[PDB]
Amino acid sequence: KLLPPERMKHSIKLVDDQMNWCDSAIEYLLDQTDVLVVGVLGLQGTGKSMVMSLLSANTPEEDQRTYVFRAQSAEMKERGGNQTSGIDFFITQERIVFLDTQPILSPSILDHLINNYNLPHTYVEMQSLQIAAFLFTVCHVVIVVQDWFTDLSLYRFLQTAEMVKPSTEYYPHLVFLQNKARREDFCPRKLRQMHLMIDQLMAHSHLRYKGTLSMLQCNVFPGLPPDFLDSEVNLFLVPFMDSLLPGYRGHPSFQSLVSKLRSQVMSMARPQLSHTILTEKNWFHYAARIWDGVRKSSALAEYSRLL
Amino acid sequence: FSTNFRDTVDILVGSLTQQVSGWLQSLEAFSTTLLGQFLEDMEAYAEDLSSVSLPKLAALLRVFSTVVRSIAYVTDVLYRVMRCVTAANQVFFSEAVLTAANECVGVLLGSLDPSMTIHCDMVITYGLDQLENCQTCGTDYIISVLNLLTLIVEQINTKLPSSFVEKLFIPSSKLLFLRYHKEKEVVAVAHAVYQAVLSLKNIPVLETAYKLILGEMTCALNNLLHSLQLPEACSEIKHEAFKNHVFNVDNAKFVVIFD
Ligand SMILES: Nc1ncnc2c1ncn2[C@@H]1O[C@H](COP(=O)(O)OP(=O)(O)OP(=O)(O)O)[C@@H](O)[C@H]1O
Numbered sequence A: 001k002l003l004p005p006e007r008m009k010h011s012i013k014l015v016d017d018q019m020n021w022c023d024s025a026i027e028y029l030l031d032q033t034d035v036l037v038v039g040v041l042g043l044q045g046t047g048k049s050m051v052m053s054l055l056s057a058n059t060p061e062e063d064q065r066t067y068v069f070r071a072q073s074a075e076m077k078e079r080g081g082n083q084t085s086g087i088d089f090f091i092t093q094e095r096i097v098f099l100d101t102q103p104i105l106s107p108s109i110l111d112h113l114i115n116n117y118n119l120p121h122t123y124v125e126m127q128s129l130q131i132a133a134f135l136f137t138v139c140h141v142v143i144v145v146q147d148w149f150t151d152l153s154l155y156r157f158l159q160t161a162e163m164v165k166p167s168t169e170y171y172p173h174l175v176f177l178q179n180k181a182r183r184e185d186f187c188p189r190k191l192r193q194m195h196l197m198i199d200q201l202m203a204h205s206h207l208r209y210k211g212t213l214s215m216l217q218c219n220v221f222p223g224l225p226p227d228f229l230d231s232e233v234n235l236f237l238v239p240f241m242d243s244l245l246p247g248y249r250g251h252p253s254f255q256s257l258v259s260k261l262r263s264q265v266m267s268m269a270r271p272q273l274s275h276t277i278l279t280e281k282n283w284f285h286y287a288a289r290i291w292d293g294v295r296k297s298s299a300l301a302e303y304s305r306l307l
Numbered sequence B: 001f002s003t004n005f006r007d008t009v010d011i012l013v014g015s016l017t018q019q020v021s022g023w024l025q026s027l028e029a030f031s032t033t034l035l036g037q038f039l040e041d042m043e044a045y046a047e048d049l050s051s052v053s054l055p056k057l058a059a060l061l062r063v064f065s066t067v068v069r070s071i072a073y074v075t076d077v078l079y080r081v082m083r084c085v086t087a088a089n090q091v092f093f094s095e096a097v098l099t100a101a102n103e104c105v106g107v108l109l110g111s112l113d114p115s116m117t118i119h120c121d122m123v124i125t126y127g128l129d130q131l132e133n134c135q136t137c138g139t140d141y142i143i144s145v146l147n148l149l150t151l152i153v154e155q156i157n158t159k160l161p162s163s164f165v166e167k168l169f170i171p172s173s174k175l176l177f178l179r180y181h182k183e184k185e186v187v188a189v190a191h192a193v194y195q196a197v198l199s200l201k202n203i204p205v206l207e208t209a210y211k212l213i214l215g216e217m218t219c220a221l222n223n224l225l226h227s228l229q230l231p232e233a234c235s236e237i238k239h240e241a242f243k244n245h246v247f248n249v250d251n252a253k254f255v256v257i258f259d
């Protein structure tokens, strides 16, 4: 007399490809409070679907075909086209809501929009900005994935997006994840440089990007002292799938790192959104309301008129 | 067959060189008599030089090496004559002729066996002279130079002077500056050279090389320790050749790993 409602087997489309709300996840929500929301931001081929699938209901021992979130296929990499479009949705058994996101400023979207108000570039930029604001207003934790380092363009985009939010103010947490890492990225000398440049590039970001999710506290570097770094920011690295010196790949096992990241993300804080207690159904309604409100907003139009 | 090869040699003396070389090698006295013509031709070209004669010399050296590879007292005379004719042309400074000459000298030296007392001073001075200006050279020339040194080191046994290896493992030597190239072929040949040098038989000639390597490793380790504010140690193997040297973190790490 206490059986669960139902178990989700595959992700659903929360936002349509034409920027339209899709109310089809109510049957998978209950009247429970204290829910966790995860958002993801990144480039075209960063690997958001793979990381989200591995962190929600998948393990590296599985195959990309049975993953919760559909990943890129062999025939799609050659054409250089995106795979995930719109916004996805999936809830695990632990009552954890996972939200995916389509690529931002991806050339595939522009190419598909060419053969279809002034220029498509402005429309793509506005769409990315709107999705970023939505992810920054109703998500408890946001993870940023970057295929390569020193992009110098995503930080500015995030700073501009945080200033175009709709509305005792609340700032969601952020996580810097570097996908497809190499041995050169697993050295203390480079780690310090990464931390200093990150701190100097987000001096007045007004966000929570430090004091939580410390890499040094994850036992990755057993002998590295915490005082060696001036300020250990919330950063994490992910290596590839599992030469005068044989062996010595230069980084820990991929499974161990993904497991540690999953545990750290699962044990993250869950602060209140507004000055009222929100439930699963209430959270969904709030998300739909803010989505509709941001669609017909004035900040986006004002910013677009300047371009 | 005596006159049949003449047409092939004339045609090859003018990217198809590999085909003619292979055909001539697989086709098979006459070589001894023909050697005089080429020797006189190169001697006359060098005498008249003291510049469009470089391609001719390169072609002659290539055909000479090909005919030699196609196959016990004239070897020393031929080697000395080749070294003298190559060193005489010290004005044009063409890498093609030098590369061909190095390959020919290497094959000729490897043809014999290390059971004689051939003139080694000329070969040593030639190698050092080439190394003195083998820093900003091409990829096809550096490999030939390294191969030449490998053949020279393996050919001469128990006759390597201490000064020969003493000037080969010092910061001023260009050998230590050749392992920093991006390509892996240079690193492989460099490692082979190191192995050949360390595979000697006389303890006194190998002690200096081992001490030099230990000194370089100690210097790199000291630089690495100082880079992180740590006192120096392990001075029991310190060498006077690295009394005061500065090595970068990456450079020191790579040097230690290579050693
Ligand atoms: N750490 C990694 N090492 C190697 N390959 C990886 C890694 N992470 C992801 N990939 C590969 O890169 C591709 C990532 O595409 P995927 O569909 O998983 O997500 P995505 O890059 O977020 O896609 P989208 O273009 O829809 O934004 C896949 O082919 C995946 O196998």
Ligand SMILES: [Mg+2]
Residues within 6 Å of the ligand: A047, A048, A049, A050, A083, A084
């Ligand atoms: Mg994706």
